């Protein structure tokens, strides 16, 4: 027989194995597919890299401490510099893709904590100064994760993001973030969390540099705790796999 905890995911030349996992969350009930002819707009023929772009890319790890507000990642920007996915999105004008996000955190039976993993579509964030809009270096940090704050960010004459956590940067209530596709990592039960988000947008394709379709938020609703003698360094790893990625409008390399 088989169990519901064990689950393997194969994509490209990458295989992810887990022995203690909750059920997979598939978007809004939709599985990522390709753009059809009765829904296309651009007339030329697109290129599908398939195995070279639809595989598991692992990012840097972050440390879960006893006082961590949380982290977020702008999904399209995060992989803009990894393998042939970044190159194809750098040489083309329009792109289209869904995602498979796997978040992993392992600890013992004597550790406790709870992390919320949510894929937020069109997470437009606010600035600490009501006068202006935040910088691109503040909003999206590639090759790294962006950290929330526990206290409100001060105002003034800058372009900082309002990274207060209980407001989620979006100026909402954080406990309602369970309206979007989500999954909880409970250290006494869960081990990892999988989310299979399809392409959400209001146009059939989009430029992948000046627009971020979704965002991965990881927040520890219940803090991490343990007793003296157990491991103190607990990391969190994120692996993203593009799905059904296609590109249209070949041009010179660059983003200007």
């Amino acid at each position: 027989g088989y169990s519901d905890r064990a689950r393997s995911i194969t994509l490209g030349n990458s295989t992810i194995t887990t022995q203690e996992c909750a059920n997979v969350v598939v978007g809004y009930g939709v599985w990522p597919d390709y753009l059809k002819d009765s829904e296309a707009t651009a007339e030329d023929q697109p290129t599908q890299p398939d195995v070279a772009t639809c595989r598991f890319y692992t990012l840097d790890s972050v440390q879960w401490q006893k006082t961590s507000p949380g982290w977020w990642w702008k999904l399209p920007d995060a992989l803009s510099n990894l393998g042939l996915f970044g190159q194809n999105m750098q040489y083309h004008y329009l792109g289209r893709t869904g995602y498979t996000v796997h978040v992993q955190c392992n600890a013992s039976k004597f550790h406790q904590g709870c992390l919320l993993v949510v894929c937020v579509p069109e997470a437009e964030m606010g600035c600490a100064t009501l006068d202006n809009t935040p910088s691109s270096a503040e909003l999206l940090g590639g090759d790294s994760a962006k950290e929330f704050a526990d206290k409100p960010v001060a105002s003034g004459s800058n372009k900082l993001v309002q990274r207060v956590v209980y407001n989620a940067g979006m100026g909402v209530g954080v406990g309602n973030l369970t309206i979007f596709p989500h999954q909880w990592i409970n250290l006494r039960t869960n081990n990892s969390a999988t989310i299979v988000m399809p392409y959400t947008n209001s146009v059939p394709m989009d430029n992948m540099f000046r627009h971020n379709n979704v965002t991965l938020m990881v927040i520890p609703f219940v803090p991490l705790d343990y007793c003296p003698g157990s491991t103190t360094y607990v990391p969190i790893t994120v692996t993203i796999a593009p799905m059904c990625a296609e590109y249209n409008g070949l041009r010179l390399a660059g983003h200007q």
């Binding site: 169990s3 519901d4 905890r5 059920n23 969350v25 809004y28 009930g29 299979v196």
Partner: protein, 57 residues
């Protein structure tokens, strides 16, 4: 080409409607469209979960 439909009445009569303009954007609002499907949000998982069954087995 009149359209006869049913009125919103209590539980436990019809009305008539005619379109006067050739732009469909001038018609009355679509008030009676009682169709709901909460399955996209309440239960979006890959594997089916029987209610009277251990979620983790």
């Amino acid at each position: 080409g009149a359209q006869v439909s049913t009125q919103k009445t209590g539980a436990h009569i019809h009305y008539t409607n005619i379109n006067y303009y050739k732009d469909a954007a001038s018609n009355s609002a679509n008030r009676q469209d009682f169709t709901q499907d909460p399955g996209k949000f309440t239960e979006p998982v890959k594997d089916i979960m029987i209610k009277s069954l251990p979620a983790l087995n």
